């Protein structure tokens, strides 16, 4: 069984970061060389692993998380980061073992006049735990008066749109991100490089 990485990296559509997609990879043979020999990535940064050694390693599970953010937010997809994305949308743990891979997707995800489909969460009562996902769309209570789910004074819709346009500067352009988590439990390791 070959691990289905192509389904993740080459997906036609990507998730909004607040509703990031997760694909569990298990019990398969992974050829990571299609990733580490590729010249298509703007970021390929690993934690706890050397990417060129990946075809020699075995893990219990691999998770592939994917979403779109803007280019100047990719730096928040790292252990120890703060900010709207790290705090309210997608959080990595301090002891992360995995790789963060991103590429400029201006040609796919931007639209003349704006692509409003990609959203992020701007308000939240507390920070996400690592790998927590919040897809709720409850009106956020910024004041002492309950909102009752009605937007208005001190009561905010918690998501905003990126509105990507192709003429935006590169830090504001959309980037597709895939986070690979390499999980070794005290258990059999069934995601392996080729033998």
């Amino acid at each position, epitope marked *: 069984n070959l691990c289905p990485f192509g389904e993740v990296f080459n997906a036609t559509r990507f998730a909004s970061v607040y509703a990031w997609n997760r694909k569990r990879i298990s019990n398969c043979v992974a050829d990571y060389s299609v990733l580490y020999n590729s010249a298509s990535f703007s970021t390929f940064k690993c934690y706890g692993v050397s990417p060129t050694k990946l075809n020699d390693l075995c893990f219990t599970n691999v998770y592939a998380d994917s979403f779109v953010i803007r280019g100047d937010e990719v730096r928040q997809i790292a252990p120890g980061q703060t900010g709207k994305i790290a705090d309210y949308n997608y959080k990595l743990p301090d002891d992360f073992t995995g790789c963060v891979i991103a590429w400029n997707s201006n040609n796919l995800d931007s639209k003349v006049g704006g692509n409003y489909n990609y959203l992020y969460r701007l308000f939240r009562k507390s920070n996400l735990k690592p790998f927590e996902r919040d897809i709720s*769309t409850e*009106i956020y209570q910024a004041g002492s008066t309950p909102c009752n789910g*009605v*937007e208005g004074f001190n009561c905010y819709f918690p*998501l*905003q*749109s990126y509105g990507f346009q192709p003429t935006y500067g590169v830090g504001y352009q959309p980037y597709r991100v895939v986070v690979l988590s390499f999980e070794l439990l005290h258990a059999p390791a069934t995601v392996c490089g080729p033998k």
Partner: nanobody
Amino acid sequence: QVQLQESGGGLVQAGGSLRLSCAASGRTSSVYNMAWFRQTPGKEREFVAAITGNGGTTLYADSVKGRLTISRGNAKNTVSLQMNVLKPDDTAVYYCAAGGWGKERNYAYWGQGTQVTVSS
């Protein structure tokens, strides 16, 4: 899936009054702030007006104050925009937006827009 649908556009004569409408569809337990933006070909889309969930607070672009009125419609997440004394340069695609406040184009939900063409 929350979607917005505008109606009421078309070809109108200068001086005339026109009402546009927007309705949200999809399962939701929220009542949104709703807004109207407009876009002329070759130009950036621009804020026109917004109204809060309960209809009690409105926000207008300075250029349209006194000529345009925004109001909530009959269902929870519906909004109306009446434009009076239409001018040729009111010609635009008019978009409904929902979820947010203010004049920037970062509201959560957006319609595909309705064309208004003013003749003289």
